[PDB]
Amino acid sequence: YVPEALMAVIEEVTAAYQKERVSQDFLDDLDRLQANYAGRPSPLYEATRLSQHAGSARIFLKREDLNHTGSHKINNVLGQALLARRMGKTRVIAETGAGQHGVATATACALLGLDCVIYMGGIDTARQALNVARMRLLGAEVVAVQTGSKTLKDAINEAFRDWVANADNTYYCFGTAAGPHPFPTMVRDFQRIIGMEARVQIQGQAGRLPDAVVACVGGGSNAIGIFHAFLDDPGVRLVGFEAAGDRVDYRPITDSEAMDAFGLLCRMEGIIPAIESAHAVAGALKLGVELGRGAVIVVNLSGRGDKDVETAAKWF
Amino acid sequence: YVPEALMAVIEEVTAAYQKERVSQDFLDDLDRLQANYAGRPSPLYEATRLSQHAGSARIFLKREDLNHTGSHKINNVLGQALLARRMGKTRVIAETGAGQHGVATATACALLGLDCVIYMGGIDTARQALNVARMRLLGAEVVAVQTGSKTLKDAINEAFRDWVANADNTYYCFGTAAGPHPFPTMVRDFQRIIGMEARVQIQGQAGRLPDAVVACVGGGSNAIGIFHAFLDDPGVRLVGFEAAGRVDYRPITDSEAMDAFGLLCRMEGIIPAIESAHAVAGALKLGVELGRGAVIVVNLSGRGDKDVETAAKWF
């Protein structure tokens, strides 16, 4: 599943990232660097037409759903490249199948100014000359790996072979589903940027801190990532909505209630939520009818607009 | 091609639009409506690795390239839908093929509070089943046309009949490939929103109006629409770059462009359209020519793609 040979190398990265977690500075720095670069900060939208169904509170939807073809992947990558740069690494590697992660990796590296090399499967190479094209346009040595299978796994290995050799100057950039996810806390932390961005936006758009910041808890981290920046704001309730069918407060939301919110959001604002987001919404509206006129609530709309259209359409 | 029966209804929309064109009211209303909604305001990005290469001017990129392939269909549809509401229409109809125009149109109606009807070929309805479900989740009514041989052509024709009969309260939303485009001015004007956005964003990010705003002029209205909002800002230069009313035109050669192309990829990791690359080349000379601390706003119009090949060949 992972060579043992990766252990000292992974241990190096974790220990180095552990030093970053002491302050907000790493995160702050990432947020600076990615500002207006590829999608970040995702928009905060005041859903004025939901207001009437939420006790006339002001519902603000943190729009993590506005991500598709591009925005997305650069986010993980840029975090990593920044870490590589602060570990005094000078060079970055990765594997990619079809080429999307190699392009993101190559992107983060031109941006931050770091040599970069990408490992592509032999017959993967000659069936997208284009991403290769992007990658070489981005300045990245593409090593088209001939040796056995031809279909990713052999590239993972050279990439692995590389990383152990060169570990003093090289960072491995992870992001393919078929590759290793060795640093799960580092991934979680990158999610806190949602709340960091949403805390600036809600005070600029709403003129203060919110009454509440709300997320569906089955989105995992990334739904929950909106909370961290509001932990020291004693006036701000943090409410995680649990899917039920039939410091943080946790509250249940049934299938029906999610479903009805899903449809109201499509009809009131023209936005088609993930069933995940519709629970956070359904709770946001109950919470506004609780809190009344003049309340301000922030909702993490996490998960994918498309996915659930089928299930929603059956349901109705 | 276009039925003559349509002349009066087209004539009413053009007349009413020409009266909106008078002031920035209509556009300020679109701007407000769509803020944070589906992509607009596109970001304004300070390209600080490029400064080295431009007299140490500051180059800001107006990131039209961050559009989704798709971001543009709701943008145009929201404009038409807000105009229907501002004219007093209560209802908006359209035809759709595979469903995208229908989904865009229903999304704009749900947003603005308007009744929606979409006419689809009876067959198109069966094949594009989840575009239909999106439409109805959106609250639109979807008519699977049973007339003729249940074709797109037959759909359009039912939609033209409903338009004519219900013109007092009903607006027709254009922008399928098989449909007409009776209002090119309207569509060109919507592009003015680019410079209105960028005029706000350059004062927050840079603290003042810029020294120039720049765009590549082969890129049509999508290029040239950044200029309008700064027209009355004497002190802001307006430069249009072309592949060699107060706007200045200058030529940019193929190899000035391709050097700007490779420079943007390599310094910023942004792969531009060749079209963006000409404006980016022009902005690099102009910073050399205005020098240190000069704020130059560049329209990055067109799509960072299909020029990829052509850029690869070149290099």
XYZ file of C-alpha atoms in Angstrom:
631
model
C 0.000 0.000 0.000
C 3.018 2.381 0.736
C 6.695 1.448 0.745
C 8.351 1.417 4.250
C 11.081 3.282 2.368
C 8.596 6.323 2.484
C 8.623 6.465 6.272
C 11.451 8.769 7.023
C 10.352 10.950 4.210
C 6.708 11.183 5.351
C 7.976 11.661 8.944
C 9.954 14.718 7.712
C 6.900 16.338 6.105
C 4.599 15.686 9.136
C 7.219 17.089 11.557
C 7.644 20.073 9.361
C 3.961 20.671 9.131
C 3.552 20.244 12.882
C 5.688 23.523 13.260
C 3.324 25.387 10.961
C 0.271 24.510 13.138
C 1.551 26.599 16.035
C 0.357 29.960 14.496
C -2.266 31.100 11.851
C 0.760 32.259 9.672
C 1.032 29.353 7.308
C -2.727 29.519 6.550
C -2.752 33.297 6.432
C 0.053 33.098 3.887
C -1.612 30.511 1.669
C -4.819 32.777 1.747
C -2.753 35.774 0.572
C -1.050 33.834 -2.124
C -4.230 32.230 -3.560
C -6.362 35.429 -3.379
C -8.014 35.852 -6.828
C -5.789 33.215 -8.362
C -8.087 30.266 -9.164
C -11.493 30.494 -7.390
C -10.496 31.493 -3.992
C -12.138 33.016 -1.952
C -15.313 31.349 -2.856
C -18.280 33.809 -2.881
C -20.584 34.586 0.102
C -24.078 35.139 -1.329
C -27.063 36.768 0.519
C -30.026 34.652 -0.409
C -32.618 37.487 -0.067
C -35.527 35.414 -1.403
C -35.065 32.688 1.459
C -35.351 35.499 3.995
C -39.245 35.246 4.152
C -38.986 31.476 4.937
C -36.468 32.122 7.744
C -38.310 34.531 10.076
C -36.885 37.392 8.014
C -33.330 36.634 9.123
C -30.578 37.189 6.604
C -29.261 33.953 5.191
C -25.733 34.084 3.588
C -24.680 31.006 1.650
C -20.862 30.397 1.633
C -20.609 29.134 -1.913
C -18.308 26.134 -1.918
C -20.566 24.704 -4.672
C -19.190 27.251 -7.306
C -16.179 25.007 -7.964
C -15.840 22.801 -11.069
C -13.318 22.167 -14.022
C -10.108 23.798 -12.622
C -10.628 25.708 -9.242
C -10.701 22.766 -6.881
C -7.331 20.945 -7.238
C -4.939 23.856 -7.271
C -6.102 24.471 -3.661
C -4.529 21.263 -2.114
C -1.497 21.707 -4.441
C -0.722 25.202 -3.575
C -0.708 24.394 0.111
C 1.804 21.679 -0.568
C 4.063 23.783 -2.809
C 4.009 26.486 -0.169
C 5.007 23.894 2.449
C 7.819 22.544 0.143
C 9.037 26.088 -0.225
C 9.087 26.652 3.565
C 10.824 23.246 4.084
C 13.564 24.772 1.944
C 12.760 22.190 -0.770
C 13.606 23.489 -4.363
C 11.991 20.866 -6.615
C 8.529 19.034 -6.644
C 7.258 15.680 -8.123
C 4.009 13.978 -8.730
C 2.283 11.350 -10.682
C -0.788 11.804 -12.737
C -2.771 9.473 -14.927
C -4.874 11.402 -17.445
C -2.749 14.586 -16.418
C -4.970 16.813 -14.355
C -2.876 16.612 -11.167
C 0.324 17.070 -13.046
C -1.129 20.298 -14.580
C -2.197 21.598 -11.112
C 1.187 20.596 -9.713
C 2.971 22.313 -12.650
C 0.745 25.329 -12.066
C 1.542 25.674 -8.311
C 5.321 25.282 -9.236
C 5.504 28.085 -11.938
C 3.613 30.243 -9.505
C 5.921 29.624 -6.564
C 9.013 29.232 -8.696
C 10.110 25.675 -8.133
C 11.420 23.122 -10.549
C 9.027 20.468 -11.025
C 8.889 17.070 -12.588
C 5.827 14.971 -13.323
C 5.538 11.140 -13.851
C 3.143 10.025 -16.618
C 2.290 6.494 -17.771
C 3.733 5.550 -21.210
C 0.405 4.976 -23.005
C -1.195 7.680 -20.779
C 1.397 10.042 -22.348
C 0.587 9.398 -26.012
C -3.188 9.678 -25.385
C -3.157 13.340 -24.077
C -0.296 15.241 -25.766
C -2.295 18.316 -24.570
C -2.009 18.150 -20.745
C 1.466 17.265 -21.398
C 1.490 20.354 -23.502
C 0.116 22.445 -20.593
C 2.586 20.853 -18.249
C 5.608 21.621 -20.506
C 4.140 25.118 -21.222
C 4.158 25.462 -17.431
C 7.869 24.557 -17.516
C 7.671 21.063 -16.042
C 9.999 18.171 -17.135
C 7.604 15.374 -18.187
C 9.126 11.905 -17.632
C 7.028 9.476 -19.774
C 7.605 6.174 -17.991
C 7.951 3.131 -20.198
C 8.869 0.236 -17.729
C 6.010 -2.332 -17.216
C 2.166 -1.883 -17.105
C 2.224 1.675 -18.822
C -0.876 2.711 -16.715
C 0.053 4.944 -13.671
C 1.391 2.386 -11.160
C 4.779 2.319 -12.744
C 4.915 6.124 -12.520
C 3.937 6.133 -8.755
C 7.002 3.984 -8.306
C 9.609 6.114 -10.161
C 8.019 9.021 -8.459
C 8.530 7.085 -5.203
C 12.064 6.089 -6.325
C 12.801 9.689 -7.020
C 11.492 11.058 -3.685
C 13.739 8.805 -1.493
C 16.878 9.668 -3.545
C 16.327 13.390 -3.530
C 14.530 14.011 -0.342
C 16.865 16.853 0.641
C 15.726 19.098 -2.183
C 12.488 17.371 -3.393
C 8.841 17.445 -2.062
C 6.311 14.883 -3.266
C 2.967 16.489 -4.253
C 0.058 14.123 -3.468
C -3.450 14.409 -5.105
C -4.260 11.450 -7.408
C -7.062 9.166 -5.933
C -4.866 6.199 -6.941
C -1.937 7.556 -4.950
C -1.167 7.856 -1.144
C -2.978 10.238 1.201
C -0.256 10.283 3.813
C -1.117 13.607 5.580
C -4.733 13.697 6.465
C -4.424 16.530 9.111
C -2.715 18.691 6.641
C -5.709 18.214 4.249
C -8.309 18.988 7.092
C -6.435 22.202 7.896
C -6.429 23.429 4.380
C -10.344 23.259 4.791
C -10.279 25.951 7.595
C -9.699 28.523 4.901
C -13.509 28.424 4.195
C -14.214 29.889 7.593
C -11.278 32.184 7.421
C -12.565 33.673 4.117
C -16.273 33.613 5.322
C -15.357 35.576 8.566
C -13.910 38.481 6.465
C -16.814 38.354 3.959
C -19.742 38.294 6.404
C -18.383 41.351 8.341
C -17.853 43.261 5.124
C -21.233 42.197 3.556
C -23.246 42.184 6.744
C -21.340 44.851 8.726
C -20.716 42.438 11.738
C -20.060 38.875 12.867
C -23.033 36.451 12.304
C -25.560 35.066 14.945
C -24.687 31.633 13.637
C -22.534 29.666 11.288
C -24.112 26.353 10.268
C -22.858 23.270 8.297
C -24.128 19.702 7.491
C -21.889 17.386 9.530
C -21.878 14.427 6.959
C -19.831 16.653 4.619
C -16.892 15.858 6.887
C -14.104 18.394 6.934
C -14.888 20.973 4.403
C -18.357 21.019 5.477
C -17.001 21.382 9.171
C -14.047 23.544 7.945
C -16.188 26.698 8.042
C -16.267 26.582 11.940
C -12.631 26.967 13.059
C -12.212 30.677 12.421
C -15.306 31.517 14.666
C -14.232 29.414 17.719
C -13.071 32.441 19.719
C -16.177 34.514 18.799
C -18.299 33.819 21.927
C -21.411 35.503 20.406
C -21.453 33.223 17.281
C -23.379 29.952 17.575
C -21.827 27.025 15.728
C -24.485 24.447 14.704
C -23.744 21.205 12.826
C -26.806 19.651 11.255
C -27.067 15.872 11.472
C -29.020 13.936 8.851
C -31.765 11.985 10.584
C -34.596 10.854 8.183
C -38.212 10.195 9.398
C -18.930 24.743 21.646
C -20.740 23.240 18.612
C -24.393 22.486 19.021
C -25.539 19.366 16.996
C -29.154 19.131 15.743
C -31.067 16.623 13.639
C -32.683 17.452 10.239
C -35.006 14.752 8.610
C -35.257 13.705 4.965
C -38.372 15.602 4.550
C -37.075 18.799 5.991
C -33.869 18.547 3.818
C -35.997 17.736 0.793
C -38.377 20.660 1.219
C -35.376 22.997 1.643
C -33.759 21.544 -1.439
C -36.814 22.503 -3.521
C -37.415 25.888 -1.868
C -33.754 26.877 -2.626
C -34.208 25.852 -6.300
C -37.458 27.799 -6.481
C -36.468 30.909 -4.396
C -32.877 31.415 -5.621
C -32.496 29.117 -8.626
C -29.672 27.210 -6.927
C -29.736 23.359 -6.975
C -27.987 22.201 -3.778
C -26.396 18.817 -2.931
C -28.698 16.854 -0.576
C -25.891 17.521 2.007
C -26.216 21.275 1.557
C -30.001 21.037 1.688
C -29.837 19.745 5.325
C -27.703 22.763 6.297
C -30.186 25.012 4.598
C -33.301 23.289 6.112
C -31.581 23.971 9.601
C -30.704 27.523 8.666
C -34.345 28.335 7.992
C -35.606 26.794 11.377
C -32.834 28.713 13.031
C -33.940 31.972 11.381
C -37.605 31.461 12.347
C -36.077 30.908 15.954
C -33.904 33.979 15.865
C -36.239 36.418 14.115
C -35.852 39.636 12.091
C -32.361 41.228 12.292
C -30.617 37.825 12.755
C -27.636 36.958 10.415
C -26.820 33.399 9.614
C -23.936 31.929 7.484
C -24.540 28.524 5.757
C -21.799 26.297 4.284
C -23.122 25.106 0.949
C -20.754 22.237 0.695
C -20.972 19.421 -1.819
C -21.950 19.338 -5.575
C -25.076 21.034 -7.211
C -25.242 18.014 -9.651
C -25.334 14.471 -7.893
C -28.669 14.447 -6.185
C -30.806 15.840 -8.928
C -31.954 12.292 -9.589
C -32.798 11.491 -6.022
C -34.462 14.902 -5.562
C -36.548 14.435 -8.734
C -37.803 10.920 -7.662
C -38.640 12.345 -4.196
C -40.780 14.989 -5.659
C -36.153 32.068 -41.169
C -37.685 34.469 -38.535
C -41.505 34.693 -38.893
C -42.779 38.125 -39.871
C -45.411 37.641 -37.170
C -42.482 38.315 -34.723
C -41.727 41.887 -35.881
C -43.901 43.800 -33.441
C -42.766 41.821 -30.379
C -39.042 42.222 -31.333
C -39.705 45.878 -32.017
C -41.182 46.373 -28.424
C -38.118 44.829 -26.686
C -35.635 46.867 -28.794
C -37.606 50.085 -28.156
C -37.650 49.410 -24.363
C -34.024 48.380 -24.174
C -32.954 51.491 -26.035
C -34.664 53.478 -23.260
C -32.693 51.490 -20.531
C -29.403 52.218 -22.514
C -29.753 55.887 -21.602
C -28.424 55.448 -17.997
C -26.291 52.873 -16.031
C -29.423 52.018 -13.921
C -30.152 48.796 -15.738
C -26.517 47.560 -15.493
C -26.134 48.635 -11.854
C -29.289 46.592 -11.196
C -27.738 43.490 -12.992
C -24.478 43.926 -11.105
C -26.276 44.004 -7.791
C -28.521 41.076 -8.605
C -25.767 38.736 -9.776
C -23.157 39.560 -7.092
C -21.714 36.379 -5.727
C -24.361 34.391 -7.512
C -22.758 32.356 -10.259
C -19.215 33.653 -10.874
C -19.515 37.430 -11.126
C -17.616 39.704 -10.194
C -14.776 37.757 -11.917
C -11.583 38.297 -9.736
C -9.026 40.977 -10.351
C -5.549 39.383 -9.761
C -2.224 41.405 -9.217
C 0.346 39.456 -11.293
C 3.400 40.433 -9.074
C 5.857 37.948 -10.813
C 5.231 39.930 -14.091
C 6.273 43.315 -12.620
C 9.964 42.435 -13.160
C 9.095 42.435 -16.828
C 7.143 45.666 -17.099
C 9.315 48.572 -15.915
C 8.271 47.318 -12.517
C 4.716 48.594 -13.193
C 1.948 46.625 -11.285
C 0.006 44.367 -13.761
C -3.582 43.351 -12.595
C -5.358 40.617 -14.478
C -9.202 40.789 -14.852
C -9.782 37.099 -14.754
C -12.442 36.577 -17.470
C -10.595 33.243 -18.085
C -11.924 31.945 -14.724
C -15.394 31.701 -16.434
C -16.886 28.232 -16.514
C -17.668 26.963 -20.051
C -21.269 27.730 -19.187
C -20.550 30.895 -17.200
C -21.975 33.215 -19.829
C -25.245 31.488 -20.510
C -26.647 32.406 -17.127
C -24.918 35.845 -17.457
C -26.775 36.615 -20.616
C -29.990 34.985 -19.474
C -30.055 36.897 -16.132
C -29.668 40.194 -18.165
C -32.650 39.376 -20.439
C -34.732 38.158 -17.460
C -34.093 41.324 -15.497
C -35.070 43.326 -18.526
C -38.346 41.378 -18.904
C -39.139 42.153 -15.263
C -38.146 45.841 -15.681
C -40.474 46.014 -18.758
C -43.401 44.625 -16.636
C -43.460 41.065 -18.100
C -44.416 38.371 -15.470
C -43.506 35.344 -17.545
C -40.521 34.136 -19.658
C -40.493 31.325 -22.279
C -37.703 29.753 -24.352
C -37.087 26.621 -26.392
C -34.314 24.221 -25.577
C -32.506 21.319 -27.345
C -30.419 19.255 -24.938
C -31.691 21.364 -22.001
C -28.902 23.893 -21.141
C -30.690 27.004 -22.298
C -33.863 25.720 -20.672
C -31.993 25.149 -17.228
C -30.295 28.598 -17.499
C -33.592 30.284 -18.332
C -35.550 28.497 -15.505
C -32.698 29.406 -12.948
C -32.984 33.168 -13.942
C -36.923 33.063 -13.591
C -36.711 31.320 -10.157
C -34.220 34.021 -8.989
C -36.289 36.945 -10.181
C -39.692 35.687 -9.149
C -40.908 35.072 -12.744
C -43.166 32.301 -14.248
C -41.259 30.113 -16.628
C -42.285 27.875 -19.620
C -39.841 25.971 -21.668
C -40.915 24.165 -24.986
C -38.790 21.034 -25.682
C -39.060 18.515 -28.531
C -41.234 15.556 -27.096
C -38.176 13.377 -27.955
C -35.525 15.782 -26.539
C -37.590 15.527 -23.269
C -37.101 11.761 -23.121
C -33.393 11.809 -23.920
C -32.465 14.881 -21.640
C -34.174 13.664 -18.699
C -32.180 15.324 -15.866
C -32.098 18.759 -17.569
C -35.956 18.349 -17.522
C -35.866 17.372 -13.826
C -33.613 20.456 -13.064
C -36.074 22.652 -14.816
C -39.077 21.374 -12.902
C -37.037 21.405 -9.448
C -36.559 25.029 -10.564
C -40.330 25.480 -10.665
C -40.503 25.914 -14.461
C -43.205 24.275 -16.528
C -41.727 21.967 -19.278
C -43.854 21.462 -22.475
C -42.898 18.259 -24.469
C -44.165 19.476 -27.769
C -46.511 16.919 -29.515
C -47.039 18.879 -32.769
C -45.211 18.273 -36.246
C -42.787 15.416 -35.643
C -41.989 16.489 -32.011
C -38.714 18.183 -33.028
C -36.634 21.312 -31.677
C -37.991 23.082 -34.815
C -41.517 22.314 -33.642
C -40.633 23.507 -30.104
C -39.503 26.878 -31.390
C -42.513 27.335 -33.418
C -44.933 26.686 -30.356
C -42.748 29.141 -28.350
C -43.034 31.751 -31.116
C -46.900 31.237 -31.052
C -47.113 31.618 -27.234
C -44.853 34.767 -27.480
C -47.112 36.440 -29.931
C -50.278 35.572 -28.124
C -49.075 36.504 -24.645
C -46.691 39.398 -25.506
C -48.428 41.824 -22.979
C -46.998 39.792 -19.936
C -44.532 37.343 -21.615
C -40.814 37.781 -22.659
C -38.983 35.383 -24.909
C -35.443 34.432 -23.777
C -32.921 33.980 -26.664
C -29.723 32.032 -27.018
C -29.979 28.435 -28.295
C -27.937 27.813 -31.556
C -31.113 27.020 -33.627
C -32.852 30.161 -32.390
C -32.663 33.733 -33.440
C -30.599 36.544 -31.887
C -32.798 39.655 -32.483
C -30.883 41.862 -30.015
C -27.054 42.139 -30.601
C -26.782 45.541 -28.994
C -28.201 44.241 -25.715
C -25.711 41.342 -25.661
C -22.701 43.657 -26.434
C -23.747 46.022 -23.667
C -23.918 43.277 -21.021
C -20.172 43.067 -21.469
C -19.895 46.523 -19.984
C -20.230 44.867 -16.618
C -16.534 43.783 -16.877
C -15.107 47.301 -16.519
C -17.728 48.270 -13.882
C -16.531 45.355 -11.796
C -12.897 46.080 -12.436
C -13.330 49.854 -11.597
C -14.524 48.888 -8.118
C -12.047 46.143 -7.616
C -8.933 48.262 -8.703
C -9.658 50.966 -6.153
C -9.994 48.452 -3.314
C -6.968 46.489 -4.286
C -4.726 49.250 -5.502
C -6.280 52.181 -3.552
C -7.032 54.299 -6.639
C -8.110 54.328 -10.372
C -5.563 52.855 -12.603
C -2.980 54.457 -15.082
C -4.313 52.341 -17.873
C -6.844 49.680 -18.719
C -5.975 47.458 -21.633
C -7.613 44.809 -23.930
C -7.052 42.940 -27.124
C -9.446 44.272 -29.767
C -9.899 41.078 -31.934
C -11.659 39.656 -28.830
C -14.922 41.485 -29.652
C -17.386 42.854 -27.125
C -16.032 40.438 -24.445
C -12.635 42.135 -24.801
C -13.573 45.733 -25.382
C -16.363 45.841 -22.646
C -13.732 46.591 -19.885
C -13.306 50.228 -21.212
C -16.715 51.776 -20.940
C -16.746 52.414 -17.159
C -13.463 54.359 -17.205
C -14.407 56.554 -20.196
C -15.151 59.439 -17.956
C -12.033 58.979 -15.877
C -9.656 61.393 -17.558
C -6.274 60.231 -16.408
C -6.975 56.554 -17.176
C -5.411 55.588 -20.527
C -7.493 53.210 -22.626
C -5.434 50.952 -24.957
C -6.630 48.417 -27.460
C -4.017 45.959 -28.789
C -4.443 44.335 -32.197
C -2.750 41.405 -33.812
C -0.172 43.175 -36.194
C -13.741 57.117 -28.924
C -10.952 58.065 -26.619
C -9.366 54.596 -26.988
C -5.762 54.344 -28.379
C -5.013 51.336 -30.756
C -1.387 49.897 -30.878
C -0.066 46.778 -32.863
C 1.321 43.671 -31.178
C 3.158 41.080 -33.291
C 2.845 37.337 -33.107
C 6.217 37.023 -31.395
C 5.597 39.750 -28.884
C 2.410 37.798 -28.020
C 4.057 34.349 -27.767
C 6.790 35.735 -25.577
C 4.087 37.171 -23.322
C 2.320 33.697 -23.444
C 5.368 31.811 -22.202
C 6.118 34.509 -19.701
C 2.644 34.277 -18.128
C 2.747 30.424 -17.783
C 6.149 30.556 -16.335
C 5.833 33.441 -13.891
C 2.158 32.976 -12.818
C 1.303 29.476 -13.972
C -1.598 31.033 -15.979
C -1.983 29.566 -19.548
C -3.670 32.392 -21.604
C -5.722 32.420 -24.909
C -3.415 33.886 -27.617
C -5.860 36.791 -27.561
C -5.129 37.444 -23.891
C -1.498 37.083 -24.696
C -1.513 40.097 -27.060
C -3.004 42.297 -24.403
C -0.568 40.930 -21.910
C 2.365 41.742 -24.277
C 0.924 45.261 -24.681
C 0.636 45.720 -21.032
C 4.367 44.747 -20.601
C 5.596 47.559 -22.961
C 3.222 50.014 -21.507
C 4.545 49.487 -17.925
C 8.087 49.942 -19.334
C 6.723 53.166 -20.792
C 4.744 54.470 -17.706
C 7.354 52.915 -15.276
C 7.510 52.118 -11.546
C 4.271 51.885 -9.591
C 2.069 52.275 -12.689
C -1.229 50.341 -12.235
C -2.241 48.568 -15.384
C -5.492 46.564 -15.556
C -5.582 43.919 -18.305
C -8.628 42.121 -19.692
C -7.824 38.426 -19.866
C -10.553 37.580 -22.373
C -10.890 34.388 -24.345
C -10.253 30.961 -22.862
C -6.886 29.498 -21.895
C -7.441 26.516 -24.408
C -7.276 25.280 -28.133
C -4.527 27.866 -28.326
C -2.723 25.253 -26.219
C -1.751 23.251 -29.353
C -0.915 26.304 -31.265
C 1.222 27.520 -28.385
C 2.920 24.143 -28.050
C 3.785 23.972 -31.836
C 5.332 27.417 -31.574
C 7.496 26.439 -28.762
